[PDB]
Amino acid sequence: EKKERLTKEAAAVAEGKSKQDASPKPYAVKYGLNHVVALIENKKAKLVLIANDVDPIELVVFLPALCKKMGVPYAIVKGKARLGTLVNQKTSAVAALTEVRAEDEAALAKLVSTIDANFADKYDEVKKHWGGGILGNKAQAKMDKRAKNS
């Protein structure tokens, strides 16, 4: 598409003395991680999606605090690979949407009303509990029969 678009402009610039204003304004997702974090903390993003599995986990763990801090409705969607396909990459690890077309405005603001219900409002009590007390099923049934006999 881009290689088709430039040859469209190269006639339109040279003939009609245009300022490359033959091309319309784009509307697309923003996906680079150094770019989404710069699109947060200017309050410029509308939704930010977050991949749960990142091999350096440390890369992403500041995003829900920074989305809560600047007030941006984040969400943790499953899969680093799923975000990659919709941005023509292999993996993407974040995805964010700055501008939306005006007709599709209502389906966006309806979607945020479900997303902030799960994530931005539970965030105060997510910090005050720990995870990971699960045991394997031999040790699980070992302590239950004791707890049954006790």
Binding site: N34, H35, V37, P56, I57, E58, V61, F62
Partner: protein, 203 residues
């Protein structure tokens, strides 16, 4: 960007998050071999500030070395000399552990050139490191003249002569009045001032 939010959060090495990532990742590095390839750096901010650029020809190895002193290899504690030298267990090995871990992966990956290295994790028995290497045959490196200084054959085996970041520390090479005995090489400034200079017309 995540340049600083990782850099500042790396420094909290006893917070409740980083001592969880420390205790999980120390397990995984024991179960692998001594020298094995990381497909990507675990610390992307620390690698990037040391000369890494994620393109074709930069290789990230991870290497594990033993921790402790250097026991002198004389047999049965026999020393055969004046009793200043009779010690064995208290000798301390002037090169750092970081520079030893560079020479290990340097002899294995011989076609590569060692760029730099950095700490990752440690244990009671081992320290863990991670060495950035550059491939001077690869045509992405032999162009783009920021990085084609490493192709030059004066830079063969930087790690073994002590020219890297931890090499110039353990030689004690910086400017100043504290570094008088070693400012331009210790054996050069020894040999200079223990040298009788005589002219044609004796001054």
């Amino acid at each position: 960007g995540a340049y600083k939010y990782l850099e500042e959060l790396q420094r909290k090495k006893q917070s409740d998050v980083l001592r969880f990532l420390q205790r999980v990742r120390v397990w995984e590095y024991r179960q692998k071999n001594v020298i094995h390839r990381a497909a990507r750096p675990t610390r992307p901010d620390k690698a990037r500030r040391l000369g890494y650029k994620a393109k074709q020809g930069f290789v990230i190895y991870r290497v594990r070395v033993r921790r402790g002193n250097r026991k002198r290899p004389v047999p049965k504690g026999a020393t055969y000399g004046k009793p200043t030298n009779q010690g064995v267990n208290e000798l301390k090995y002037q090169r750092s552990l970081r520079a030893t871990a560079e020479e290990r992966v340097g002899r294995r990956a011989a076609n590569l050139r060692v760029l730099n290295s950095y700490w990752v994790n440690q244990d009671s028995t081992y320290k863990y490191f991670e060495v950035i290497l550059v491939d001077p045959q690869h045509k992405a490196i032999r162009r783009d003249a920021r990085y084609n200084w490493i192709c030059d054959p004066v830079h063969k085996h930087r790690e073994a002569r002590g020219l890297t970041a931890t090499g110039k520390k353990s030689r004690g090479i910086n400017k100043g009045h504290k570094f008088n005995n070693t400012k331009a090489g210790r054996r050069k400034t020894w040999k200079r001032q223990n040298t009788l200079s005589l002219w044609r017309y004796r001054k």
